[PDB]
């Protein structure tokens, strides 16, 4: 029962279920964004044909993509429909956990033979898909950061006038921030054109254009930023799932400094990310927890661990005064700093 | 059923998909062949050695400890309870993952009706090359040699169709010396691979290649040598002869082209039917749902045992093949 050692006609179906768990891995982001697990969710069940005329989808594929769920238990397929499995309400969960390993990082780990060579580690040695990694990172954002992020808010003791968002991506956040205090002023901050232009649009969308504005920005410089004039009437900052991109620590305590001088009237800062784990035996790891860790090393990008984070704050001129476990992102943390 | 048992089974399902990638990686790397001779090895030791960047190394090793295939103690590894069952399927492990990966990825983008013209997926085929050379000597070679041994008759010019690395032709000149060997293979790639494996090993004399598309095998010139050809070989692309009525007449051209064939040895996998979604073996379900993305058509056994008188040949002998989903080894003439 986890620790054991086998028959022949098990060790048989172990293997067999990791290929076929392979090919529903990528099912699951799969069929999130093409409605699937959508109408799995809403109705319990669904029509194979209905759903790929509905769709416009080939349909000996789509019957492919449901045989690949139904092979580890996800759904159950039943003649011409496919209802609901044992395992659907936790795969659906984590389904965008599911999107990013495959949709987003499949090629990096695909790659893996001609990653690990130093020969080959120069120059651009990966490749990621940027779009399909962004929209996996808008509901893994909301769907395991909401809670934590939304708590902190409440505890922040001051209403904010001005908000600054590092990494600020979809703009998602800055908007429910808007949302939530009328009248307030929000400026994201992203490297990614792409990210800037969706945001602008999406909020020029919910009619947020005189509240919100963005910029091209690389926040572990924050000082050599066109746009810092705004920046001294900011009294809340804040940075999600993009913080283990101001270490290694050296540079994490002078990115950290900068961002004290760069905006002097923030009261609070707001800092959600997940973390490198310790010491969690290689078969009782969770959902995510392996592949982030694995890909990061893969792309030689350094990941804090949670005490890591802890012993660098006040070098980095900031004191922790709150802190907030998220609930099943592998160890993923929210700090709330002043 | 049980919040706990559905957490822990979502968990395997991520982490397959990294053990199922690092299989793939841990055979071409090497790791698998050093843990098959010694039944462990050293992270730092095996990291040295084939100037590995150590932290990727040590979670790949993870990824196949999450599953069972290997133990991980200190920095050292040791072979896991599947570790025996999963060596042994490598080759279907990288097929899926470094030779198909980026097919499966875009399950999203490939499904779509409107996405589907013109070049809507692509294949690693150095990936996909590299594993089919195991994947044929490992399931197919014992039917293979099977019928070669009861052929009824010594061969003198044998042709394979979709030749790859050239390593059946020159495994049938080392049986057989003084045959002579032709190979067809629709691949420029797979051409000059074969051509330098001949000739290095000492075979160009009698050994050479043909590009082109045993599809219109009618149409490949080979200066007259298809003629002299009595064994006719074809293994693992045979189904890119369908559907049925492009078979049929793919498999008249090969008579046509071939007139002095005496046997023709035709191995492929198969597509299945009726097995239980749950009790789906290793290849199968990739096999299936590949070719069904891909577009291309996949014959069940029966349609292939149907398909050959029309096709112009009789079918003799039938050999089932061990644990390639179902596989199949005909001899026809
Ligand atoms: N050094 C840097 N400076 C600014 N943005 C960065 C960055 N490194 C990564 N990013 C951005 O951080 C984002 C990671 S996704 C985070 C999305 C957002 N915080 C949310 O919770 O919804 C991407 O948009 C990426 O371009
Ligand atoms: N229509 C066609 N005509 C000729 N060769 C083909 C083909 N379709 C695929 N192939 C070739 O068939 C090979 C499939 S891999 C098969 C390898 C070989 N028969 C063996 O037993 O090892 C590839 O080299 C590919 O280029
Ligand atoms: O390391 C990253 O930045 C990416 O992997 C991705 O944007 C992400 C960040 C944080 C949590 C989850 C995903
Ligand atoms: O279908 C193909 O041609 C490939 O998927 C692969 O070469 C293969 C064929 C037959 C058996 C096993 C693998
Ligand atoms: O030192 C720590 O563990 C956390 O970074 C922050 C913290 C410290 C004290 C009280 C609350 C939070
Ligand atoms: O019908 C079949 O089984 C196969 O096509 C081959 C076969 C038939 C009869 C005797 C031997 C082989
Ligand atoms: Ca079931
Ligand atoms: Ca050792
Ligand atoms: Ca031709
Ligand atoms: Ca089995
Ligand atoms: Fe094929």
């Given at each position: 029962?986890?620790?054991?050692?086998?028959?022949?006609?098990?060790?048989?179906?172990?293997?067999?279920?990791?290929?076929?768990?392979?090919?529903?891995?990528?099912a699951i982001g799969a069929a999130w964004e093409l409605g699937a697990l959508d109408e799995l969710r809403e109705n319990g069940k669904l029509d194979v044909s209905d759903?790929?005329?509905?769709?416009?989808?080939?349909?000996?594929?789509?019957?492919?993509?449901?045989?690949?769920?139904?092979?580890?238990?996800?759904?159950?397929?039943?003649?011409?429909?496919?209802?609901?499995?044992?395992?659907?309400?936790?795969?659906?969960?984590?389904?965008?956990?599911?999107?990013?390993?495959?949709?987003?990082?499949?090629?990096?780990?695909?790659?893996?033979?001609?990653?690990?060579?130093?020969?080959?580690?120069?120059?651009?040695?990966?490749?990621?898909?940027?779009?399909?990694?962004?929209?996996?990172?808008?509901?893994?954002?909301?769907?395991?950061?909401?809670?934590?992020?939304?708590?902190?808010?409440?505890?922040?003791?001051?209403?904010?006038?001005?908000?600054?968002?590092?990494?600020?991506?979809?703009?998602?956040?800055?908007?429910?921030?808007?949302?939530?205090?009328?009248?307030?002023?929000?400026?994201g901050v992203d490297i990614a054109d792409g990210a800037i232009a969706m945001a602008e649009k999406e909020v020029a969308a919910k009619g947020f254009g005189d509240q919100?504005?963005?910029?091209?920005?690389?926040?572990?410089?924050?000082?050599?930023?066109?746009?810092?004039?705004?920046?001294?009437?900011?009294?809340?900052?804040?940075?999600?799932?993009?913080?283990?991109?101001?270490?290694?620590?050296?540079?994490?305590?002078?990115?950290?400094?900068?961002?004290?001088?760069?905006?002097?009237?923030?009261?609070?800062?707001?800092?959600?990310?997940?973390?490198?784990?310790?010491?969690?035996?290689?078969?009782?790891?969770p959902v995510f927890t392996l592949g982030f860790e694995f890909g990061h090393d893969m792309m030689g990008e350094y990941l804090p661990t949670l005490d890591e984070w802890?012993?660098?704050?006040?070098?980095?001129?900031?004191?922790?005064?709150?802190?907030?476990?998220?609930?099943?992102?592998?160890?993923?943390?929210?700090?709330?700093?002043?």
């Open positions: 029962h986890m620790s054991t050692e086998v028959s022949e006609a098990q060790a048989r179906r172990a293997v067999a279920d990791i290929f076929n768990s392979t090919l529903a891995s990528s759903f790929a005329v509905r769709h416009d989808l080939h349909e000996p594929a789509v019957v492919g993509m449901f045989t690949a769920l139904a092979s580890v238990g996800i759904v159950r397929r039943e003649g011409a429909t496919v209802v609901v499995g044992p395992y659907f309400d936790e795969a659906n969960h984590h389904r965008s956990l599911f999107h990013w390993l495959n949709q987003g990082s499949g090629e990096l780990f695909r790659r893996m033979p001609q990653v690990l060579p130093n020969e080959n580690r120069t120059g651009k040695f990966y490749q990621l898909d940027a779009g399909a990694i962004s929209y996996a990172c808008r509901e893994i954002s909301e769907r395991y950061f909401d809670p934590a992020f939304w708590a902190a808010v409440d505890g922040l003791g001051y209403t904010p006038t001005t908000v600054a968002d590092l990494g600020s991506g979809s703009g998602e956040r800055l908007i429910q921030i808007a949302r939530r205090f009328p009248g307030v002023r929000g400026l919100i504005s963005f910029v091209r920005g690389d926040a572990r410089t924050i000082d050599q930023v066109s746009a810092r004039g705004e920046f001294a009437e900011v009294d809340l900052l804040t940075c999600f799932m993009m913080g283990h991109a101001f270490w290694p620590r050296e540079n994490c305590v002078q990115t950290l400094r900068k961002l004290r001088a760069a905006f002097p009237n923030v009261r609070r800062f707001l800092l959600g990310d997940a973390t490198r784990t310790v010491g969690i035996p290689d078969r009782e790891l802890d012993g660098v704050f006040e070098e980095g001129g900031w004191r922790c005064v709150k802190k907030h476990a998220i609930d099943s992102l592998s160890v993923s943390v929210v700090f709330e700093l002043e």
